[PDB]
Structure 1
Amino acid sequence: KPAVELDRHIDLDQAHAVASGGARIVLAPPARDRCRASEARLGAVIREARHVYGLTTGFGPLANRLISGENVRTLQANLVHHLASGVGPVLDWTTARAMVLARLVSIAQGASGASEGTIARLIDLLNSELAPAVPSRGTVGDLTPLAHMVLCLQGRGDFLDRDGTRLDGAEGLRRGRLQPLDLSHRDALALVNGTSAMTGIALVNAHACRHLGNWAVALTALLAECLRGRTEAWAAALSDLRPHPGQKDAAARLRARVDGSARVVRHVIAERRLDAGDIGTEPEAGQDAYSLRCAPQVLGAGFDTLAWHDRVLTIELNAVTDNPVFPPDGSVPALHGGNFMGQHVALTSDALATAVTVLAGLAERQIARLTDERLNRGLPPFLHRGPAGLNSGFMGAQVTATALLAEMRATGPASIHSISTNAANQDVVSLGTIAARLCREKIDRWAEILAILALCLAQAAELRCGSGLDGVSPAGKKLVQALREQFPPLETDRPLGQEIAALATHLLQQSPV
């Protein structure tokens, strides 16, 4: 199993690898040294009785109640207690671990004061096959979910195995070989702080979107091979005229997908010189409908949105979103501010959510065109096999895709719903965790719509080019053959619900390569 050495910076791929259990995690010596130095600084702050939130004060508006050193253990224990008011389905295994990792990366910068033991508890969890069982709702953007995490790590909360099966606190510590979290150093705020939950949810969203984006491209390409699509619309020259990075990338990836294909139309229409005799109505127009012709532009805009989201998220993931914080340079004993305000993830998650809904709509319209006997240039209605009428093929699945898209559209941005709370102390809140969660739901819906499109295209390719897929590009052939290893052709109507669900799960974790 590969290992990710965490020093100061970790990229999104490395983060997902650790969160997903694909890689172990190790704290590099430099990071351990910085953290040990921060641990010492917290010790000094405490010995000096400096006025520091959480060390000598109550919480929120109650910070005006100063606390004596002898009562800090109780203080921080009750912090975790009152914050554990979360409700709703627990975060999935990968996401909960991504949250744990997000808190760890912040701590690794060396300004949180976390003790070596506390850090070890986070590392141990990530190297185990377990995840804390944390409720998904309750935060306005992430004290509540992190408090639940703390309780779990103390053996006072459930754990999740890779399959999602729940284990009680005691069993989790035993099975994962985890030691109970001990906060005797008064470093509880190093664990209950920042934007860890929304950041964890967001990095999982990022990974899923990369794979779905690859599928969106690969299916658009296969669509072209099933409907005699025109490749000139995907020409590099057009990209150069409207140089959006995401568009250029999309167009390039589309051209690569259909390289070697004999099923697409490559002629440049303007090369044709017309004669008087040609004047009249031709069978087909010289350009395709937008679901093919404008794929670079639509996909590209979505890709540029994801690029922005990922740039912002990379900074957030590697930042210290803690409050208070302890300056490594020792300029002041501690700083008090609001780096826990998750507005960055809130806004990027909302923007990505819109992009996902837009790209899902493209896929949905691609299915709608491919299955329409009036628009699919000669293919069977709904790509059925067997006697028509007696069989409807993908007619149900097509409507299901529309249903999934319509549902996605009903939910909008989470960020615009800030409500003054906490006795007006938190008079503005980010709702970033909700934003990231709403984006995740759309991503899941998009995966299902793409799954339906994938199943439709495997059938359409065979109906158009025969089981041998004559004229189909090497990439298209590889994709269909891969699908057919687990999903049989539709020779007669059958229930597709379970296959759609199974395929969607795959699309979210792997690309067509």
Structure 2
Amino acid sequence: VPVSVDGETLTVEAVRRVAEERATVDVPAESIAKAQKSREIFEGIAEQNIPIFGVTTGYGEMIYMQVDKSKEVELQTNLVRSHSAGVGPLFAEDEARAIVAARLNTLAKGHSAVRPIILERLAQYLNEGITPAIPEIGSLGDLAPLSHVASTLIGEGYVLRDGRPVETAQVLAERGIEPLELRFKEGLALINGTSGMTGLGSLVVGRALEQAQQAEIVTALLIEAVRGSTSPFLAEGHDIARPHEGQIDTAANMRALMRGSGLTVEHADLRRELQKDKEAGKDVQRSEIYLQKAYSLRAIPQVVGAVRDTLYHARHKLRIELNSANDNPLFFEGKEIFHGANFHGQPIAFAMDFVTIALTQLGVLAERQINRVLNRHLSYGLPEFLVSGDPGLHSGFAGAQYPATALVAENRTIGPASTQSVPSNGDNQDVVSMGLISARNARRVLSNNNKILAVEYLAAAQAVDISGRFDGLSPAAKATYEAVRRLVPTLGVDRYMADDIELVADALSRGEFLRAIARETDIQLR
């Protein structure tokens, strides 16, 4: 299962494989050769003492400082050090690995003028399990975080071991590795890109998509458990009447998940049951039958679909970015040293701010579906707060609804960061993107959404037990139901709810509910 880091075809899912599943990485000889190439282009110029940014000059506003080739190695060392000023908590192992891979892929595109050893060493770290200790704060959108990574290649800084930072010097001398010594433009190239936000963003987006699927999965279970109509998901509504890709995809997944359900109702059945319930003698009469259900159980295609569209767009931008030469300056055949701003992370800063927004609404919808099932006037029949015990004496899921509701409110306090640029570096960086903050914002909402969904999964499984509708559940709903009971038992009388919720929340973050559908059925969700 090797992953080709060529600076051209790396996908978001592949980055997750490398970061999450320790997937082996391989930098193609073509990438290596193309890499050495640009290296000679550069050196063929660096030979002379001619001016070039970040290699024969100062850094930032100090580009006005001309520097000779004498202390080539020191210039790189001074940069990586002075810029390793990151603060806050350290990124997690998988997060740090995703960042490292994005940077490797970037250098592997071939226009950074870096020695092949840089790519080879980076590739060794991932493959050898040596993860840099990357503090989360510092990037203006990603100098500081990438600087901490840079430090570990030169045997400095810290590496992540069992959740704690351990000096890189020891770890290397340990597994017998001579720390690299950075040459011209290697220090700058290592840190002058969007690898922080792009690496983290990839994990988040990939996971956001699974969350969309897992929202659809429990949403489907809930719809069955309450015998909702299937009309809202009919293809004519989306494939033909309002063709947004996301909407079509969710409507599709919903039909597959509820297919073969004995509990769901066809519109025609409602229309006919409702009709018989009417007295042809009077113009206006009351009925207890709802031809339609509330928005939270009817508008799933529109809302989750819009979220999907947002995630598709974000994945699209990341795929391009991962495979871009987000670095400066750059080198091309018979070309002058390209001086631009491909280090600017606006594209990804925007994409992630949009992910934050989309996932917030995904959570808003899940929480209202929980409110749906817990409220007796809205549940369509189930007992208040899903009590099995004498009600009042027992509260059921009443208290468990609070953290879900609370999280919706907390996610709404998270504002966009891609527009919060603040000028620094003597007005040199007068417009930045703060994209890493955007990525972290989306990560937070994603994380909070698993807790919201956790309560929804527990609630949906409980509604099944109380209604005694298990034998009517569809193949998918049975799988979902069983995956939940496997982790948490039915709620007879009241009990400490926290562990159960965190138990189902962690399962969701590991994609165990998407897994269950995969194993127990042949449905291949979009």
Report if the CA contact (8 A) 1:118-1:182 is conserved.
Answer: no
Structure 2: which amino acid aligns with 1:419?
Answer: V
Q: Which residue number corresponds to residue 194 of structure 1?
A: 193
1:496 aligns with 2:469: no
Aligned partner of residue 457 in structure 2, secondary structure: helix
1:159 aligns with 2:164: no
Identical residues among aligned pairs (%): 38
1:426 aligns with 2:429: yes
CA distance in 1 between partners of 2:11 and 2:178 (Å): 28
CA distance in 1 between partners of 2:160 and 2:346 (Å): 29
Structure 2: which amino acid aligns with 1:190?
Answer: A
Q: Which residue number corresponds to residue 182 of structure 2?
A: 183
Report if the CA contact (8 A) 1:132-1:153 is conserved.
Answer: no
- Superposed displacement of residue 75, structure 1: 1.7
Structure 2: which amino acid aligns with 1:500?
Answer: I
Q: Which residue number corresponds to residue 473 of structure 1?
A: 474
Structure 2: which amino acid aligns with 1:477?
Answer: K
Report if the CA contact (8 A) 1:308-1:348 is conserved.
Answer: yes
Q: Once structures 1 and 2 are overlaid, which stretch shifts more, 113-122 or 313-322?
A: 113-122
Query: Per the alignment, do residues 32 and 388 of structure 1 end up closer, same or farther by CA in structure 2, a change over 3 Å counting?
Result: same
Q: Which residue number corresponds to residue 482 of structure 1?
A: 483
Aligned partner of residue 485 in structure 1, secondary structure: helix
Aligned partner of residue 416 in structure 2, secondary structure: coil
Q: Which residue number corresponds to residue 417 of structure 1?
A: 420
Aligned partner of residue 191 in structure 1, secondary structure: helix
Query: Per the alignment, do residues 159 and 49 of structure 1 end up closer, same or farther by CA in structure 2, a change over 3 Å counting?
Result: same
Query: Per the alignment, do residues 231 and 340 of structure 1 end up closer, same or farther by CA in structure 2, a change over 3 Å counting?
Result: same
CA distance in 2 between partners of 1:464 and 1:177 (Å): 63
CA distance in 1 between partners of 2:390 and 2:175 (Å): 56
Q: Which residue number corresponds to residue 276 of structure 1?
A: 280
CA distance in 2 between partners of 1:248 and 1:480 (Å): 26
- Superposed displacement of residue 297, structure 1: 0.4
Q: Which residue number corresponds to residue 220 of structure 2?
A: 221
Report if the CA contact (8 A) 2:49-2:68 is conserved.
Answer: no
CA distance in 2 between partners of 1:178 and 1:367 (Å): 54
Query: Per the alignment, do residues 39 and 398 of structure 1 end up closer, same or farther by CA in structure 2, a change over 3 Å counting?
Result: same
> TM-score when scaled to structure 2?
0.93
1:31 aligns with 2:31: yes
1:331 aligns with 2:335: yes
Report if the CA contact (8 A) 2:267-2:291 is conserved.
Answer: no
- Superposed displacement of residue 275, structure 1: 6.3
1:383 aligns with 2:383: no
CA distance in 2 between partners of 1:187 and 1:44 (Å): 16
- Superposed displacement of residue 386, structure 1: 2.5
Report if the CA contact (8 A) 2:79-2:188 is conserved.
Answer: no
Deviations 1:106-139 (A, max 9, x none): 1111111221221122101111233211111111
Aligned partner of residue 419 in structure 2, secondary structure: helix
Report if the CA contact (8 A) 1:21-1:129 is conserved.
Answer: no
Q: Which residue number corresponds to residue 135 of structure 1?
A: 135
- Superposed displacement of residue 406, structure 1: 0.5
CA distance in 1 between partners of 2:281 and 2:178 (Å): 86
Q: Which residue number corresponds to residue 522 of structure 2?
A: none
Query: Per the alignment, do residues 382 and 177 of structure 1 end up closer, same or farther by CA in structure 2, a change over 3 Å counting?
Result: farther
Aligned partner of residue 66 in structure 2, secondary structure: coil
- Superposed displacement of residue 166, structure 1: 3.7
* Alignment gaps of 5+ in structure 1: none
Structure 1: which amino acid aligns with 2:24?
Answer: R
CA distance in 1 between partners of 2:242 and 2:461 (Å): 33
Q: Select 1:318's aligned residue among 313, 323, 331.
A: 323
Report if the CA contact (8 A) 2:487-2:504 is conserved.
Answer: no
- Superposed displacement of residue 220, structure 1: 1.0
- Superposed displacement of residue 81, structure 1: 1.6
Report if the CA contact (8 A) 2:76-2:185 is conserved.
Answer: yes
Q: Which residue number corresponds to residue 303 of structure 1?
A: 308
Q: Which residue number corresponds to residue 401 of structure 1?
A: 404
Query: Per the alignment, do residues 174 and 16 of structure 1 end up closer, same or farther by CA in structure 2, a change over 3 Å counting?
Result: farther
Query: Per the alignment, do residues 506 and 55 of structure 1 end up closer, same or farther by CA in structure 2, a change over 3 Å counting?
Result: same
Q: Which residue number corresponds to residue 125 of structure 1?
A: 125
- Superposed displacement of residue 277, structure 1: 4.3
Structure 1: which amino acid aligns with 2:21?
Answer: G
Aligned partner of residue 89 in structure 1, secondary structure: strand
Deviations 1:182-221 (A, max 9, x none): 2145522221111000001100111111111111101111
CA distance in 2 between partners of 1:66 and 1:425 (Å): 17
Q: Select 1:443's aligned residue among 428, 443, 446.
A: 446
Aligned partner of residue 55 in structure 1, secondary structure: coil
Aligned partner of residue 131 in structure 1, secondary structure: coil
CA distance in 2 between partners of 1:160 and 1:498 (Å): 28
CA distance in 1 between partners of 2:226 and 2:177 (Å): 56
Aligned partner of residue 395 in structure 1, secondary structure: coil
Deviations 1:44-77 (A, max 9, x none): 2221223111111001110101001102222221
Structure 1: which amino acid aligns with 2:293?
Answer: D
Structure 2: which amino acid aligns with 1:167?
Answer: V
Report if the CA contact (8 A) 1:93-1:130 is conserved.
Answer: no
Report if the CA contact (8 A) 1:198-1:436 is conserved.
Answer: yes
Query: Per the alignment, do residues 215 and 175 of structure 1 end up closer, same or farther by CA in structure 2, a change over 3 Å counting?
Result: farther
CA distance in 2 between partners of 1:277 and 1:173 (Å): 89
CA distance in 1 between partners of 2:129 and 2:28 (Å): 22
Query: Per the alignment, do residues 88 and 276 of structure 1 end up closer, same or farther by CA in structure 2, a change over 3 Å counting?
Result: same
CA distance in 2 between partners of 1:391 and 1:175 (Å): 59
Aligned partner of residue 61 in structure 1, secondary structure: helix
Deviations 1:288-309 (A, max 9, x none): 0000111110100000011111
Report if the CA contact (8 A) 1:31-1:109 is conserved.
Answer: yes
Query: Per the alignment, do residues 178 and 458 of structure 1 end up closer, same or farther by CA in structure 2, a change over 3 Å counting?
Result: farther
Query: Per the alignment, do residues 264 and 431 of structure 1 end up closer, same or farther by CA in structure 2, a change over 3 Å counting?
Result: same
Q: Once structures 1 and 2 are overlaid, which stretch shifts more, 184-193 or 144-153?
A: 184-193
Report if the CA contact (8 A) 2:72-2:183 is conserved.
Answer: no
Task: Tell me how many residue pairs correspond in the alignment.
Answer: 507
CA distance in 2 between partners of 1:170 and 1:51 (Å): 34
> TM-score when scaled to structure 1?
0.95
Aligned partner of residue 441 in structure 1, secondary structure: helix
Report if the CA contact (8 A) 2:232-2:299 is conserved.
Answer: yes
Aligned partner of residue 191 in structure 2, secondary structure: coil
Write out aligned runs for 1:248-267 (5 A).
Answer: 248-267=248-267
CA distance in 1 between partners of 2:171 and 2:452 (Å): 37
Q: Which residue number corresponds to residue 73 of structure 1?
A: 73
1:61 aligns with 2:57: no
Report if the CA contact (8 A) 2:487-2:503 is conserved.
Answer: no
CA distance in 2 between partners of 1:353 and 1:178 (Å): 41
Report if the CA contact (8 A) 1:117-1:182 is conserved.
Answer: no
